[PDB]
Amino acid sequence: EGVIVNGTQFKDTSGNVIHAHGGGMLKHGDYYYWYGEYRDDSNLFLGVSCYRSKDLVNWEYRGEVLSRNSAPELNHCNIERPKVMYNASTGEFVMWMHWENGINYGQARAAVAYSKTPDGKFTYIRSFRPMQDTGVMDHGLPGYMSRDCNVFVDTDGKGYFISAANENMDLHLYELTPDYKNIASLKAKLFVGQQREAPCLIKRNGYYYLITSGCTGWNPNQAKYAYSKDLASGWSQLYNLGNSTTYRSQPTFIIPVQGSSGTSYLYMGDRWAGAWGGKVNDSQYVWLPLNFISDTTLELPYYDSVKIDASSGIISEYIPDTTRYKLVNKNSGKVLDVLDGSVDNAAQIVQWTDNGSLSQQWYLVDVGGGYKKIVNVKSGRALDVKDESKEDGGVLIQYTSNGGYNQHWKFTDIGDGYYKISSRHCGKLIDVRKWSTEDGGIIQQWSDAGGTNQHWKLVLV
Numbered sequence: 001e002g003v004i005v006n007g008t009q010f011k012d013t014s015g016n017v018i019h020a021h022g023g024g025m026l027k028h029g030d031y032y033y034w035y036g037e038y039r040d041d042s043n044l045f046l047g048v049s050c051y052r053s054k055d056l057v058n059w060e061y062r063g064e065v066l067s068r069n070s071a072p073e074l075n076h077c078n079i080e081r082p083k084v085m086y087n088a089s090t091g092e093f094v095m096w097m098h099w100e101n102g103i104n105y106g107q108a109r110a111a112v113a114y115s116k117t118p119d120g121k122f123t124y125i126r127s128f129r130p131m132q133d134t135g136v137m138d139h140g141l142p143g144y145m146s147r148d149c150n151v152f153v154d155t156d157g158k159g160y161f162i163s164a165a166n167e168n169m170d171l172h173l174y175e176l177t178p179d180y181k182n183i184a185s186l187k188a189k190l191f192v193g194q195q196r197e198a199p200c201l202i203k204r205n206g207y208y209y210l211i212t213s214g215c216t217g218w219n220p221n222q223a224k225y226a227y228s229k230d231l232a233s234g235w236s237q238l239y240n241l242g243n244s245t246t247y248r249s250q251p252t253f254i255i256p257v258q259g260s261s262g263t264s265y266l267y268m269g270d271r272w273a274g275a276w277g278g279k280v281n282d283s284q285y286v287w288l289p290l291n292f293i294s295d296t297t298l299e300l301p302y303y304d305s306v307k308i309d310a311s312s313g314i315i316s317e318y319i320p321d322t323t324r325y326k327l328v329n330k331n332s333g334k335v336l337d338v339l340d341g342s343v344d345n346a347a348q349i350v351q352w353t354d355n356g357s358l359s360q361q362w363y364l365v366d367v368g369g370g371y372k373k374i375v376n377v378k379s380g381r382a383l384d385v386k387d388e389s390k391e392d393g394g395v396l397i398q399y400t401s402n403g404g405y406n407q408h409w410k411f412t413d414i415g416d417g418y419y420k421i422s423s424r425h426c427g428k429l430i431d432v433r434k435w436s437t438e439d440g441g442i443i444q445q446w447s448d449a450g451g452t453n454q455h456w457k458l459v460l461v
């Protein structure tokens with residue numbers, strides 16, 4: 001049972017809450033290593049924990065790979081967003097992170113560490129602002145500011161370190177030394193003035209992808225991404241990813257999951273407790289599948305429960321009840337279907353003669369209360385009210401599962417096998433436009449009028 005309950009604090013095999021906040025993950029050999037950090041009683045760095053697992057569900061605690069006692073400089077400081085990377089040349093692992101003095105956020109510098117073994121305790125080197133000796137000054141201190149950070153290993157074996165500089169206004173991609181333990185130079189300045197934070201750098205099909213959040217502290221915001229053929233130039237504009245709050249989380253890292261059937265990408269996010277005035281140690285996690293519709297189109301869906309298989313390399317929503325259904329309209333006699341049976345996102349929903357097609361079959365996922373999600377079978381997209389409309393004539397379409405109320409539906413029995421499927425957003429129910437009795441009849445949203453065109457039959461397949 002490789003199921004994951006989003007919006008909660010995962011537990012280790014010991015039954016204790018996992019504390020690897022704002023962390024990344026590394027795949028070395030036959031093991032996945034999850035690294036992260038957690039505060040003490042004074043909201044300061046006390047230790048970086050390490051968990052390993054082969055199924056990505058059952059994590060084994062391996063103690064602190066880094067601690068406040070690991071170095072006299074770490075006794076009292078703020079460390080966040082620790083990422084690790086492996087080096088084929090050296091044969092050792094190098095850890096990077098964001099370092100602060102612990103009394104304010106003026107230092108804005110990066111830190112380095114390394115170890116012979118992943119689960120082994122790293123040895124702290126030094127904290128510094130990227131390229132201090134270049135005689136460059138960034139807001140009074142020497143060297144570029146380094147806040148939110150993340151690591152990336154290219155195909156050619158080159159190491160890279162990206163962080164937020166110029167008061168979090170710009171992004172800096174630094175080319176690392178062959179040993180990954182130092183910064184050789186900077187590759188390019190990305191998205192200046194955009195003020196993008198919590199950067200995540202990944203690569204697929206010769207394309208470079210950069211997932212970033214917004215700069216609004218604990219407040220969950222809109223996550224975005226961009227692609228490019230090279231790192232120096234050719235970067236596309238920022239495109240939205242997920243909803244307006246990234247499903248109440250902030251992107252921390254993205255990792256390719258190798259399997260037998262193929263490869264899928266795991267999005268890791270942090271649900272910072274600071275959103276509700278909670279301690280950093282209370283923060284939760286949000287893992288989601290990053291789908292690549294195309295080379296220039298990504299989708300980050302939200303599933304309250306996500307099933308994953310490492311050996312298979314598959315990441316998708318977990319549906320406890322896979323019973324397929326067909327919604328038949330009382331009036332028209334037609335069944336709920338997707339226009340042209342398209343699997344494309346934002347596809348129009350129309351009625352059609354029962355032809356036993358996949359596009360006419362639907363799943364039913366309970367989402368708490370008397371409400372459920374109506375997910376199409378052919379395309380994993382769910383029934384959705386376009387632009388979260390609250391008015392009559394609101395066109396219905398199939399959209400990426402975003403946990404929005406415009407995607408939750410309540411079934412109400414009115415006798416026989418017919419129901420009145422109302423929306424959780426405004427209460428208005430599913431309605432065939434103009435009582436249409438022909439094929440291609442636009443399925444919409446409308447007030448309860450007691451008309452047969454608003455009555456649907458639930459049929460098994």
Ligand SMILES: OC[C@H]1O[C@@H](O)[C@H](O)[C@@H](O)[C@H]1O
Nearest residue numbers: 346384385386387388399404
């Ligand atoms: O395509 C427009 C989008 O508007 C969003 O506000 C809504 O949550 C999505 O379901 C989709 O309708």
